[PDB]
Structure formats: structure tokens, C-alpha cells
Nucleic acid binder design. Structure first.
Ligand SMILES: [Mg+2]
Ligand SMILES: [Mg+2]
Length: 346
RNA sequence: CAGU
């Protein structure tokens, strides 16, 4: 891309094949994703985690929360399982950067996975924004990402509500998830990022509510972030729940890819919190709730990172641009692929 | 930059 910026990066053949062929998501991948929301294997994993860590922290409170794509219903059989281990009722505590205690806890847990004959330690990432332990649960073979941060569980619950209220959202996310993998873009643009882009797009079509309109104040807080939401019936908002049909899905996907092919990433951001068209990067910070403003006043270093090629704001952790690591050339690659994909969908 |  960098060598020939003037050339539209060719949509990879693996992607072209799947776009030109949409019945697979509707008839096969959807039922598997729906089944993967609840399977017996997850109970074994949570139980074995409690059994493994209960001795390491004897009197301490302990609770395990599942989240991620398997739980929201856009997973596949190879999908990893994401788990939040809360030791000591830290659910409501927000760490911008992982604290010493948090890193201390992760280090203690690392040893337990190594020594245990039911777990294989795969990786221990301490210096990430969200430190995680990557380990294989050997009885099931399921790869688990273990963290000490509640935010992923909270946005998983929000996706659950959105997908169940408007199933078209779920189908589209399964499709673009697979499209992202066949385009080999997942390392720059994550499945979670594209899910927020789908949600935002459908908000602009008046098929989903702005997240802010679900949070009119009693607030549940993880630090400064409002993590609960009114589970309002879509009828009360006049939001029609569409029947997901292959033509309906195809038309919305076409429009989705067309929209992000022409989106002005230099001046606007994807903003499911606001859920309105043309949210300017230059205006967004003054549009956020009072807790965000109070938090960044005391900590200006924790404001959302807006000076990035691609800005997609987490609807709950409002200081997180989930696409902050996307490069100009990764963005151009994504824009070119959107362009060619919209064409192939007519 | 790494879970989501
Ligand atoms: Mg996952
Ligand atoms: Mg994971």
C-alpha cells in the first residue's frame, strides 16, 4: 500500500469468493454462533478456575465472568473464551493502566496455571492496557483469555441486549467478522471494533438506539464509566424489529460497506454512544457525560485518543478509541476492501 | 499496540 498509495489494494481472493457467493451465515454459521452462547464446556471451565484459584486466595471473594464473542453469539468453534476473574470484589474499580496489585495477582495466577495439569500456559502479557493470561483448558481444549478487568463483561451484556432486540445486528456481525478474517485484517481492526461499527451504522438507519439514550439517570459504575443501561423494549422507542432475511441482510451489508468506504475518518468518529450521523472529532469530548468530563479534567492523560487515523469510540469506556492502533495504510486497506465489497454486493 |  505504502509503495503504491494510488492503487486500490485488491480485495483478497478468499474474500471475493465469499462475497460473490450470503446464505451460509443465515442457514449455517448463525445456528452454530447461537448454540455457542451456552455450552456445557463453559461450566467446567469456570468451575475449574474457581477450584484452581480458591486455594491461592483462601478467604478472598471470587467470581468468574464469561464474555467475548462466544457469549454475545457471533463465535465459531475455534473462537477463544474470554474470562474475567474478580478477586476481592474489584468489579467496580477502573484501572486505566494495570496497577501493581493487578500485575501481582496475574503473576500469582500464572504459577497456578503452569503447575496445574488441567491448564497449559500459552502466554502471560503483563504490559498490555488489559494484562491477560492466555491458557488452554486441557479437558475441553478451549483457549481462554483471563483478565482482571470487568469492562469486557459489561460491553458483552450490552451487545447481548442489542443482538437479541435486533437480530439483524447479529447476522451482520457474523458476516463482517468472517469478512475481516478472509481479508486478513483482524490484527488491525478487531471483531469487537467492527461490531461497534455495525451497531453505529444501524443506529444511523434508526434500527438501534444511541447508548446514551439508554443511560438517562440508577447508574452502575466501573470507575467513571456507566456500565448499565435501560433494557427498554424497542417498541417503546418505535424501533422496528426486522425479520432477518437474506435480501434484508444483503442490502444492509451493501450499505454498511458503502458507508465505511466513503466515511471521512479524518474528521468524524464511529460513535455508538451518540448514535447520530457525522459526530465530529473536534466536538465529541464536549458531548460526553459529566463523569467523563470530570475524569479527564483530573487526568488529561486519560482522554480518548483522537489524533489517530481511525477513531471508533467504545460506547461504555468512553476514553477508549478501540481502533487506536490502526495505521494510515491499514485504514486505506480497510477502505479499499469496503469499496470493492460494496460493489460485489451490487 | 495486545481482552472486549
Ligand atoms: Mg474472544
Ligand atoms: Mg480472547
Amino acid at each position: 500500500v505504502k509503495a503504491r498509495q494510488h492503487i486500490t489494494v485488491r480485495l483478497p481472493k478468499k474474500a471475493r469468493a465469499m462475497i460473490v457467493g450470503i446464505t451460509n451465515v443465515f442457514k449455517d454459521k448463525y445456528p452454530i454462533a447461537d448454540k455457542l452462547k451456552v455450552i456445557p464446556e463453559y461450566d467446567v471451565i469456570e468451575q475449574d478456575l474457581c477450584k484452581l484459584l480458591s486455594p491461592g486466595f483462601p478467604k478472598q471473594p471470587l467470581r468468574v465472568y464469561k464474555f467475548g464473542s462466544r457469549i454475545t453469539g457471533i463465535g465459531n468453534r475455534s473462537s477463544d473464551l474470554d474470562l474475567f476473574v474478580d478477586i476481592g470484589n474489584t468489579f467496580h474499580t477502573f484501572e486505566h493502566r494495570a496497577s501493581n496489585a493487578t500485575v501481582a495477582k496475574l503473576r500469582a495466577m500464572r504459577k497456578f496455571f503452569c503447575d496445574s495439569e488441567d491448564w497449559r500456559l500459552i502466554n502471560f502479557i503483563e504490559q498490555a492496557r488489559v494484562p491477560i493470561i492466555k491458557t488452554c483448558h486441557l479437558p475441553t481444549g478451549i483457549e481462554c483469555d483471563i483478565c482482571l478487568n470487568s469492562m469486557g463483561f459489561c460491553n458483552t451484556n450490552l451487545l447481548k441486549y442489542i443482538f437479541e432486540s435486533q437480530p439483524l445486528t447479529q447476522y451482520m456481525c457474523i458476516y463482517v467478522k468472517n469478512w475481516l478474517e478472509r481479508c486478513k485484517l483482524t490484527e488491525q481492526i478487531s471483531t469487537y471494533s467492527i461490531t461497534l461499527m455495525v451497531i453505529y451504522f444501524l443506529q444511523l438507519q434508526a434500527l438501534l438506539p444511541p447508548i446514551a439514550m439508554l443511560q438517562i439517570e440508577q447508574a452502575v459504575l466501573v470507575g467513571p464509566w456507566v456500565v448499565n443501561f435501560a433494557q427498554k423494549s424497542f417498541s417503546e422507542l418505535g424501533l422496528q424489529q426486522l425479520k432477518a432475511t437474506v435480501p434484508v441482510i444483503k442490502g444492509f451489508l451493501r450499505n454498511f460497506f458503502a458507508y465505511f468506504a466513503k466515511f471521512d475518518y479524518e474528521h468524524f468518529l464511529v460513535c455508538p454512544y451518540i448514535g447520530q450521523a457525522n459526530v465530529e472529532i473536534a466536538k465529541i469530548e464536549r458531548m460526553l457525560h459529566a463523569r467523563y468530563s470530570a475524569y479527564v479534567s483530573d487526568n488529561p492523560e486519560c482522554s480518548i485518543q483522537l489524533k489517530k487515523p481511525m477513531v471508533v469510540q467504545d460506547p461504555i469506556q468512553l476514553n477508549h478509541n478501540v481502533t487506536k492502533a490502526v495505521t494510515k495504510y491499514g485504514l486505506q486497506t480497510f477502505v479499499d476492501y469496503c469499496q470493492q465489497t460494496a460493489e460485489l454486493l451490487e
